[PDB]
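## tool: complex_structure
## caller: assistant
## args:
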Amino acid sequence: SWRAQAASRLLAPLKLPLVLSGVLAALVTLAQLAPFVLLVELSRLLVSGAGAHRLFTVGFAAVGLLGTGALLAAALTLWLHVIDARFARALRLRLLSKLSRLPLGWFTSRGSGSIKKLVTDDTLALHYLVTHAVPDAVAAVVAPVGVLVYLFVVDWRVALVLFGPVLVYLTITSSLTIQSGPRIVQAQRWAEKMNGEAGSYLEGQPVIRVFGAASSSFRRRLDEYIGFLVAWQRPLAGKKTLMDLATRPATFLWLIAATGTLLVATHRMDPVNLLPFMFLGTTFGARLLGIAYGLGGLRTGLLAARHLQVTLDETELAVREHPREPLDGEAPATVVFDHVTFGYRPGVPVIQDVSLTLRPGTVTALVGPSGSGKSTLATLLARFHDVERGAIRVGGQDIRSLAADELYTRVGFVLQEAQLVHGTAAENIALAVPDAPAEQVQVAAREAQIHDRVLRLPDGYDTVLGANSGLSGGERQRLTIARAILGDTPVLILDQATAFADPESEYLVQQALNRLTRDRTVLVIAHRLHTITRADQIVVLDHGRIVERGTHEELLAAGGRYCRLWDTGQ
Amino acid sequence: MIRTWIALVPNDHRARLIGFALLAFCSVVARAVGTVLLVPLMAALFGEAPQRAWLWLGWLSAATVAGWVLDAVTARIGIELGFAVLNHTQHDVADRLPVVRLDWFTAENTATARQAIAATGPELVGLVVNLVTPLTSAILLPAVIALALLPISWQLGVAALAGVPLLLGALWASAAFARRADTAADKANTALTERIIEFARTQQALRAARRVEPARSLVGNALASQHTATMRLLGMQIPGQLLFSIASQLALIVLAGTTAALTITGTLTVPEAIALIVVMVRYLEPFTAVSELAPALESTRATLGRIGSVLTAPVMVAGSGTWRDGAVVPRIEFDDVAFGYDGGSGPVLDGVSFCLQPGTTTAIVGPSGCGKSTILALIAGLHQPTRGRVLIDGTDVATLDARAQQAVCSVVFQHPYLFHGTIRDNVFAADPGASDDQFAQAVRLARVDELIARLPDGANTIVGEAGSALSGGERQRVSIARALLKAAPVLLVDQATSALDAENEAAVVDALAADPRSRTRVIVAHRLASIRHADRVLFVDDGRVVEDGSISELLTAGGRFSQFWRQ
Ligand SMILES: Nc1ncnc2c1ncn2[C@@H]1O[C@H](COP(=O)(O)OP(=O)(O)OP(=O)(O)O)[C@@H](O)[C@H]1O
Ligand SMILES: Nc1ncnc2c1ncn2[C@@H]1O[C@H](COP(=O)(O)OP(=O)(O)OP(=O)(O)O)[C@@H](O)[C@H]1O
Ligand SMILES: [Mg+2]
Ligand SMILES: [Mg+2]
Ligand SMILES: [Mg+2]
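## result:
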């Protein structure tokens, strides 16, 4: 596609440094074309005489102009690569500031290999289109058109032969932009498809070493990528070579030498009129070839610019959507669900009409079968998903009107999959509060019963952990329980947090969490029903709807759905 | 690019690789001869009779046609050497990766592998033409033009030989000025892509810790450093361009001085010097052709360095033994094993010895971080011990063929990782040539049949990147179903119940312990109702097996196991 819409709204702040680099690239190519109009006046001057005082100043004015035109041509392709390295950053800094507020459903559909591509290899695919696209298209129009105009007035007969290569070039370059135009979009579906395979082939390495047949889907999406590159570059490099053999300065120098030795041998021409050809009819080939070899990049920069603008127009999580008012009924740090309805796919719902409310200083349980909307409830409380019906009001105000920088300073979260960033052991505990001086990280680690272990790493609290390069899974979540103890919040939402903890090191972590949160609001999702026997309110939740709520001594002693989820395990 | 790229091409192509460097030398020789044949032509096209320039146009036409043919042939043989290096190296990397030691994949040895298997694309099928063909052609052209100028007069031959050391030195100094800034820009780009992948992967934690805005993101700093590195690279690249311009200018001055001197003294006529001017323009063109190819040269240097670093990784040890028709419900046994991790504290295990009976369930309980998921990884074979021996059915596991020792275990990992696809694809990833009877058996034992009958497009639902399109319990049950669908006569189950609720875990435990296929099962557990069946418990603590025995007698003698659950 040759459309520019959504590719002219994106790269619109470079409005002027493209009209100014078009008059500064059709003025530089007139300075790299000046030495050869002087080598032509000197060549027709040697033949006649012109005592050395005149040959000095046309020979020295053609070896200085070469240097000058080669110097003020690298001063423009350096000013262009600077205002592009400065624009790629200003653009890919708007990308990861825009998709830092898209709903998490936008992340779990692209993956991590199609998001890395979008940011790195899509703002890098606009190079050619930005820097060297207008100069190459404004030089290949003023050098050939004009070096072929000046040559039709010296001799139309010989200059009529130089259209031979120009006509063969125009067909080989027109049967190329036609032939390879589905394979410029078909090759962007393979880049973001091989990035995903590369991501899932290095991370899931312990699985490929046991089952083996899991690498089948990678080794079969690779013989196809190779088979697609093979029959994409095979017929393209031949047409990129037949396009250089016709545009080469050794072809014009033979055509001229062959058609001028026909007009001078038959006395039709004078050999002194060939001189304007030998030095000028060989220049415009470079410009023609440069604009021809740069249509693939020019068309890839229009797909990249269209993928980058359909993303910068997405619907994000607005921070004023609908508040009632900040007051009238609920104290600070009390959460309230009312008639909440949500579903990840438009058709199917996940949670259906849950009411529920958490009091300022009490503990709630949120128990229930697996796959029954509990992590989803916590997630849409964290404002990751923007529920579809009903409201959520933490502290009296809808969470759709909190700045997402005042929301996460009220609610704290210990997620169900303990993920930690690539930093030291103290840049993973002080992640919410990066500046806990040094003896608050130690107190947080002391409360989460991980201080003695972290003080055993190769170099203590300064050991770079990264993605599972230390800290066995049972104690890489006690480092995320400390990350939420440090940076205390008036309401803490604990997910399944003691899943990987033994029942001697979970009795201490859940005892140093009963002393801290004596006035906080807690919601502790749990599957071990014996840890939460002493909660203030247990709420069963199966198939996305509350079915039972009480104090567990009313639950196991009146009714079911809990007296047959607790009796299966005693 | 040379002696590095030559190492990538296979040997069956080392019969048409030394026949490709000949058709390029003949190509540049034809180009140089066609360029030089203009001086005898223009000298007879200006003379008394210009009709004796016909015998000098036949030769120019011959040279031009030969140049056309040779360039087309070397552009056709070029891509056939890219389609044979890309294929070879990609397949070699894909086959090498599942054998590299698990302690090789650090945080920086993983970005390298990911770039090797993800970035290397049209720049491996297009360096054999794009990079090396014009580069060697432009390097060779001035010297051959000088050797062809020698017959006209030797002064110009020795004046144009003096030009090629200038071009070589300009190339060397241009590549040596920017080299540090270039490798720094490469490191910055790699760090930026790694930070971007981390930001896209662990996004909920970053959001809940409000570290997502680029003012405080961990990726904003990487982007800033990447920008400064690229600006420094742009600034350091220009001395190379100025030096190339200076080399061009002074070589042109030497050639023009020799030509003017030889014209004045009386050797060359005036018709000849005019053709020599065109010859020297053609001579100067390679100088401006190499300036473009230098940066691409450094880029392909970096790419091939990455590929080679991946291809020269330390592989895991493996002997040559095999099995007797697989195993036959084997007996695992540790023989004074001791294993410490590569980067970390001292040894996890040190001299742990025990013998597991064949066809018996065995539990491994203990405190957190006390060496259990490392005992399972030593049994499986994912880690070689640093002292001692692991004997499955008597045969040391490290004296077995690499493909005959990954078929005696089916592991359920602590952190389940499913691949991108549907549910049935992941379940069939263990045994792809399975029927529907064994598939239904596996999926029913792991309580995934109700999960499938409870989903809109069950057995075809996408499962996200790892399991992100599934709950923590559904992903774990899919992993259990996958691990049960394999004929390995050893079932290493890890925690594998942490996420299942009270009535899913009881069903899964009963079904897993009521398997029709006889196996040697090993269970690691933190819950008490999760073993309930194992006839032998191993209470590992800090790396030592404090005590073992049956559950019916460990809780009647006051020890670690008795009071490990009362409180
Ligand atoms: N990113 C997603 N896209 C689509 N569907 C999802 C996504 N995440 C979860 N689901 C679906 O929503 C349902 C609710 O799952 P949820 O994560 O709430 O389970 P849960 O009750 O927390 O489970 P457990 O307690 O066992 O961890 C699940 O059946 C799951 O299939
Ligand atoms: N990838 C790794 N690199 C370096 N050290 C590690 C790595 N994984 C674990 N360790 C260390 O080795 C020791 C043994 O860890 P292991 O995985 O056996 O713990 P675990 O018994 O699985 O813990 P849990 O039972 O709580 O999951 C741990 O103390 C841990 O700190
Ligand atoms: Mg560039
Ligand atoms: Mg959950
Ligand atoms: Mg473990």
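## assistant note: Chain B touches chain A through 163 residues (CB under 8 Å). Strands of chain B lie at 332-339, 349-355, 362-365, 387-392, 395-396, 410-412, 490-493, 520-524, 537-541, 544-549. Handing back to user.
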